[PDB]
Write a protein that binds this ligand. Structure first.
Ligand SMILES: CC(C)c1cnn2c(NCc3ccccc3)cc(N[C@@H](CO)[C@H](O)CO)nc12
Length: 289
């Protein structure tokens, strides 16, 4: 039903193509992943979870022991945009608008009790209208998040919340707040905040910046499955050192998004109310297509 126009990239679950609907001219992104019917039932329910900051899921097609997901197509991703902005950075009003829009996307999904679980710049997609959109929402619950992609590329740990790294089995909406916080910091500084290259390196990078967590800041932490008394005990650093030249409001929100305790970490809804968004607007990015 579709002719491929070009390879878009390799996703966690399979290859993604820009394609034109061979009869209707419609340009879409087709993601190609026999599948368990649990994964079919779950994915199908996502066709209803529509929001302007969630990439629209157009169709799910189960055929020939393969699964195709047909999505609306966006022309750029946030990872590419950040690399393209390396030399001068993303201007603050655009960072602010993108953070605000993503939190609206989270507030929506969270309200329907759906989490993403694997937010990263690769799956935040942007258009010429100044919009940014969450892709892959809901796919982690459907297939798990594995250690490597189907092409054996490493699944990044850089945005993983510490409760997940600490072996927690039942994680909450707060894991998406943690990742988005990490992505916010990386847009501001132009460098990944916690670029771990193993689970313990990712944990220790977290502890080196935010302090080794203990029962004072996180009740129950010492009881988590992968917690070890023998973790080195690092002191917390100042956010003023971590994401200069972010302003006091943005530092305050960041600090709330990166609370160790997922019960104390700010909600997407609360975050939309933060003073940081007092003067939020919607600029246009410059994109070369
Ligand atoms: C499939 C749909 C969400 C979807 C819709 N657009 N799109 C883009 N657009 C940006 C782009 C990048 C290169 C060439 C042309 C456009 C990248 C992408 N990336 C995949 C793979 O890199 C990621 O898995 C997030 O879905 N997935 C998608």
């Amino acid at each position: 039903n579709f002719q491929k126009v070009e390879k878009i990239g390799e996703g966690t679950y399979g290859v993604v193509y820009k394609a034109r609907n061979k009869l209707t001219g419609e340009v879409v992104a087709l993601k190609k992943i026999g599948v368990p019917s649990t994964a079919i039932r779950e994915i199908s329910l996502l066709k209803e979870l529509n929001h302007p900051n969630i990439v629209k899921l157009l169709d799910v097609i189960h055929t020939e022991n393969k699964l195709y997901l047909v999505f609306e197509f966006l022309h750029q991703d946030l990872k590419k945009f950040m690399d393209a902005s390396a030399l001068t950075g993303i201007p603050l009003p655009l960072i602010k608008s993108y953070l605000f829009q993503l939190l609206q996307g989270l507030a929506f999904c969270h309200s329907h009790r759906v989490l993403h679980r694997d937010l990263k710049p690769q799956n935040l997609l942007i258009n010429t209208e100044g919009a940014i959109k969450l892709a892959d929402f809901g796919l982690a619950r459907a297939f798990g998040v594995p250690v490597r992609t189907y092409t054996h590329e490493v699944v990044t740990l850089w945005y993983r919340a510490p409760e997940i790294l600490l072996g927690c089995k039942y994680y909450s909406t707060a894991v998406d707040i943690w990742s988005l916080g990490c992505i916010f910091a990386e847009m501001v500084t132009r460098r990944a905040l916690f670029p771990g290259d193993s689970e313990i390196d990712q944990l220790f990078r977290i502890f080196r910046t935010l302090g080794t967590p203990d029962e004072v800041v996180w009740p129950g932490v010492t009881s988590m499955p992968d917690y070890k008394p023998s973790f080195p005990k690092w002191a917390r650093q100042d956010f003023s050192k971590v994401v200069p030249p972010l302003d006091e409001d943005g530092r305050s929100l960041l600090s709330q998004m990166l609370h160790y305790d997922p019960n104390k970490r700010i909600s997407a809804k609360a975050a939309l109310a933060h003073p940081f968004f007092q003067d939020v607007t919607k600029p246009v990015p410059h994109l070369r297509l």
